[PDB]
Design a protein around this nucleic acid. Structure first.
Ligand SMILES: [Mg+2]
Ligand SMILES: [Mg+2]
Ligand SMILES: [Mg+2]
Ligand SMILES: [Mg+2]
Ligand SMILES: [Mg+2]
Ligand SMILES: [Zn+2]
Ligand SMILES: [Zn+2]
Ligand SMILES: [Zn+2]
Ligand SMILES: [Zn+2]
Ligand SMILES: [Zn+2]
Ligand SMILES: [Zn+2]
Lengths: 103, 103
DNA sequence: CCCTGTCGCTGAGAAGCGTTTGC
DNA sequence: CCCTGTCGCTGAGAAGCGTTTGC
């Protein structure tokens, strides 16, 4: 049931993705099929989300939406998309989501 | 892919299972379909194996064969089968298998 | 009134072939 | 010669709807 984690190279990042990076959490479009789930807010939406470049990462715990990465970690998804060494907060052990903060 | 853990009540234990409890690890019968995997020796065989009664347990980590439970923990599978409060060594945090001993 | 924001819950949390059997 | 025994490796290690959005 685990979704395979695929590292999208920075060269394959397209302008359409940056344009679709969410800037308002209430301006999201839900889609049970094409949407992606943000690890932080746990919403499956169609806005562009981060891609963890850590090979040891797995699943969707490396996927963060615009508002969540902006407000919970002070980082921009556009910068994370273009960063080839970017690691997700779960990989860095700094994730402050409701599940990761207790454990 | 996780096999559902089902608690078999002690009243439903049958004599055919005790007779099929393994007494020699080299006298096992491998079966990819009907066999069960012992958590300790990681062999999928048809001999009777333990059933963990802990509701919080999951998967097959509570399944131990005759020789493994006898030699690695000093307990008999027949006694474990008839014990309604029996917990697997992984549940007790005392498992000494090659994977559990390091972690 | 201002940096336009977030957690609960369920079900989830491997298994088994291969290279495997003591001093 | 005796209590008739065991580990490596791969792939595994959730996700997302619902009850969800700041002081
Ligand atoms: Mg699974
Ligand atoms: Mg569900
Ligand atoms: Mg379950
Ligand atoms: Mg395999
Ligand atoms: Mg894998
Ligand atoms: Zn989010
Ligand atoms: Zn990661
Ligand atoms: Zn987290
Ligand atoms: Zn065994
Ligand atoms: Zn157990
Ligand atoms: Zn173990």
């Amino acid at each position: 049931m685990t979704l395979p984690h695929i590292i999208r190279p920075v060269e394959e990042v397209t302008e359409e993705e940056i344009r679709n990076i969410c800037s308002n959490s209430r301006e999201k479009i839900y889609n049970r099929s094409l949407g992606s789930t943000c690890h932080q807010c746990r919403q499956k939406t169609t806005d562009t989300k981060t891609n963890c470049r850590n090979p040891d990462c797995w699943g969707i715990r490396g996927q963060f939406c615009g508002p969540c990465l902006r407000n919970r970690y002070g980082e921009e998804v556009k910068d994370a998309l273009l960063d080839p060494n970017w690691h997700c907060p779960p990989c860095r052990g700094i994730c402050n989501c409701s599940f990761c903060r207790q454990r």
